[model samples]
Target: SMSVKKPKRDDSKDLALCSMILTEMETHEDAWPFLLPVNLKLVPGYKKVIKKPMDFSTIREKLSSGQYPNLETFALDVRLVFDNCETFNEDDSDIGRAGHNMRKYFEKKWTDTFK
Candidate 1:
């Protein structure tokens, strides 16, 4: 019932990662296990493909080779990077940090809710 127009997997040159994730989720079912939510804790900002962020051309090359470890690595790095924002920078640290805090907030929510 929902949809994304085209796509942006990470926050690089493409400003539409949200939509891209949705579409990829649609076509690539193998990616579904990774995409599914553990609880109500998931959100769009959790989309952090840019963590181990690579260029689109490289992403395309790796993806075509079927080495999805790159994909998983990017996703998990997104989680970890968004979890620890002290890692990015000063001028724009808050952007990633706020996202990290949000994920932390949701992790707490899920923990309490499940407990």
Candidate 2:
């Protein structure tokens, strides 16, 4: 378990995003596969810089520590964990397509989260 001190700021939007994305990373025995290819490898030489599988706890910690300027950049950081494929192209691949979908979902969710 991770402990984070929620800053006295408008963190709800990012918080909700963290929660939503975090939810998909968990187990789904009774549910359909929410995320394809359950696991991902770390970017060589970047393991120390990036977490293999980013989770809500890490997101909360980043937000609390002022590491991320905003949720946009924060999402960008989270997306790095998905950049470990042999071939890289957003135009193809299962995870690539899913990553696009995830961003689209987060785009709307981020706006709706604030309002």
Candidate 3:
């Protein structure tokens, strides 16, 4: 015997589902471009649970083994130095420490590219 049913389509529901996924991916680099299978949401919440103020690492630590601590911010202050590379001319705007290399590079490259 074969039982059949076609899934119904609701534009609003479809868009909501798509946007929810897009938001998650955009928010977390650790979420996207992974080789292993990963569940987008491990701790399931209800429909009304739109946003979480907590950081992902804190949430993971708490949810995985049930130890909880509220995380305020995760930004690092001390920077990393890749090497002794420093102090070039005006064309050497790309010169920066390792910590902010990617961010600074992107900013410089995109600054005039956008304008």
Candidate 4:
């Protein structure tokens, strides 16, 4: 069996955030439209977990596997999805606005809930 390496001390909170995001996603399917695309791009070859439905245990398993260096990197990866998308502009198209709002929700949620 492959052994999972533990994250370093400073990264515990970051790891927790990753776990929290997956946990939240179990209830909030809306996070996927943005999360899926970001994860697909961030985790090369889509080889990392972020499972089809994103279960908590699966996320923990992958994190234990050390696929991510830190959660802040993941956060930036998510932001990149919006930064590169032409549709994610300030014009306020329905989907575009939703994308922006979703990003906002994550930023705020992370600070408010993920001590």
Candidate 5:
């Protein structure tokens, strides 16, 4: 007798790719503002403007813990960080520029790796 079942969904490759991308993002010079959550004391109004806060540190934690079911979910969180940055900082500001650069880098890496 043999039991029958399709192979379970495997995401190990996605996880490894995510980890690599996150590492590169963390080391990028323009990643400073996005490396961690915005300090509440420093940006008191951050929570008010951005209902959901995302950062590289938090993304790493989620990826490490296998919290993301797929690569798309992982990308969503990364994009959220940039979206929040755009919301909170002026385009001409240093942090805002950094966010743009980081976003571009991430997207390029993502496309190159997956698509």
Candidate 6:
């Protein structure tokens, strides 16, 4: 009886926290490269190297639509955005460095919020 109520409350809390983290990420300066899907025409071979592309806009949509059942799945999508960036861009490249910075911001925010 007590445990049943706990799950629902925790779910809502997680949702709120996730939404907050997402908004922060969207406003980050380095978020430009990760705001939308990479243009296949502009970046040739992007599809070949990165099998699954993820971005902030996509994550926002998923978050608002209840597509992410838990924080883990939401976090996975966030990480995917960075992972794809690392795979396709040079470490010293502008976009590549942005990804690294954004990932660091995200992980720190996530840790502060959840842990």
Best by lDDT: 6
Compare the candidates by TM-score and give the number of the best one.
6
| TM-score for each candidate, following the candidate numbering | 0.26, 0.41, 0.19, 0.50, 0.88, 0.89
Residues 2-111 of candidate 2: C-alpha lDDT, one tens digit per residue: 68676577665675565565455333231122333333363344344334545445555675677876667776654553443212434476656655655565556556
Output the worst ten-in-a-row residue range by lDDT, candidate 1: 31-40
Write out the backbone clash pairs for model 5: none
Q: lDDT of candidate 3 vs native?
A: 0.29
lDDT of 3 by residue, 1-115 (tens): 2676678543344333323432342354332212122233663441234222222333333334524221111111001111111211122344333214433542343343332
Clashes of each: 2, 0, 0, 0, 0, 0
lDDT (tens digit, per residue) of candidate 6 on 42-67: 98899788899899999999999989
* Winner of 1 and 4 under lDDT: 4
The pairs that clash in candidate 3 are: none
* Cα lDDT, all candidates: 0.39, 0.51, 0.29, 0.54, 0.90, 0.91
Q: On a 0 to 100 scale, what is the lDDT of residue 33 in model 2?
A: 23
Better of 3 and 6 by lDDT: 6
Q: Model 1, which residues run further than 4 Å from truth?
A: 1-51, 54-78, 81-85
- List runs of model 4 lying over 4 Å from the truth: 1-10, 25-29, 35-65, 86-90, 113-115
Candidate that beats the other on TM-score, 4 or 6, i.e. the better one: 6
Instruction: State candidate 3's TM-score.
Output: 0.19
Q: Give Cα distance to truth, residue 93, candidate 3, Å.
A: 28
Error of 6 at 17 (Å): 1.2
Q: Which stretches of model 3 miss by more than 4 angstroms? A: 1-11, 31-115
| Better lDDT candidate (3, 4) | 4
